[PDB]
Amino acid sequence: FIVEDDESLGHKELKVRKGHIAKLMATEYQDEYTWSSLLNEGLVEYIDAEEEESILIAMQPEDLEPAEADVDPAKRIRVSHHATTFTHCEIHPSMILGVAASIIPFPDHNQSPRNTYQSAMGKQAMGVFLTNYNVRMDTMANILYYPQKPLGTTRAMEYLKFRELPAGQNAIVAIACYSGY
Amino acid sequence: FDMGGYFIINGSEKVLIAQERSAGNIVQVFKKAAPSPISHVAEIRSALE
Amino acid sequence: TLSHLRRTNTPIAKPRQLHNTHWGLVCPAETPEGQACGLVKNL
């Protein structure tokens, strides 16, 4: 997202406004305002690692953009909107992950290697590789009889079609010492 | 749900893996180790687009 | 499948380590546990 000092009605603010967001969702429901619309209206930009060196990104929009005039002890400890010189804003920090790491529930609550192990094992999990498995003649195909969409999901799974073609079941799990087996 | 982005060669579906490389026409200065008679080197991997 | 079509190979200073520049470009978690750890990246 592009952040501009010009916003007559105040300080530094994101080029995209509530209007753009509604204009987009109107097109989402009607299935005019596309991704290309945001790009040609100069609200969003493409930054490589070399251009990244000369810019200042904010993590959240709302949180990293107001000012200063109690805090939930259950939440994680975050920094601040320290800088005024913000040039860009992060669309979503969860977009730093890839297709495999994107299906991990709460990866921000695990020890880093455990997340590496999952985005490896997920690749070997039975499910439904395509809805046309009955018309394909592949050496080896493994289809899980009754797949189940996960109860615990990520927002990124929408774009990954995970809910549509899942690779597991919601087993009722007990974490206990029983027979010793 | 099939995404494409792959080829069909003699029946089998093939993916071309994105191959990483160092960018060309780029000036980079490197410090050379203690045994070397040369202290620093300025390299450019100059090749046509 | 999706994950395979978004894969990278680095053929061969510290290539295997997760670089600062990899932020938002390449996946921090998804890499092989093996002798390809840090050389096989995913977008």
Binding site: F1, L14, K18, E28, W35, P61, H92, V99, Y159 | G4 | -
Partner: peptide, 30 residues
Amino acid sequence: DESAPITAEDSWAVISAFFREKGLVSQQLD
């Protein structure tokens, strides 16, 4: 108002718009 600033929830509408246009294997195709 249409000129109101965006929220953290709103960013998913932009992402939805990104993938609707690009898809997941855009890099291979393009």
